[PDB]
Amino acid sequence: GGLTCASAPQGTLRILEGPQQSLSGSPLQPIPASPPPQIPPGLRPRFCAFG
């Protein structure tokens, strides 16, 4: 138990978690565009001129 000074280390291992990327890199999934306003069907001339 003299606890002498040992030599300098050769290198460094570093352990850390890696993320999973099987999900991302996929084609994007955007929010679907709301439709442009379309005229309602069944619009008729309700007003007829008097006389």
Partner 1 sequence: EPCGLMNHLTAVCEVVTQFVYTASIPALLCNLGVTPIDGAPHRSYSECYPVLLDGVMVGWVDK
Q: Is 12 in the site for partner 1 (CB under 8 A)?
A: yes
**Dihedral over alpha carbons 14, 19, 20, 23 (to 10 degrees):** -160
The CA-atom distances, in angstroms, between 26 and each of 17, 21, 23, 29 are 22, 9, 6, 9
17 binding partner 1? (CB under 8 A): yes
Distance, CA of 29 to CA of 23 (rounded, Å): 12
Does position 14 interact with partner 1 (CB under 8 A)? The reply is yes
Nearer to partner 1, 11 or 25 (CB): 11
* 5, 16, 39, 48: residue in contact with partner 1 (rule CB under 8 A): 16
Write down the least CB distance from residue 14 to partner 1, Å. 6
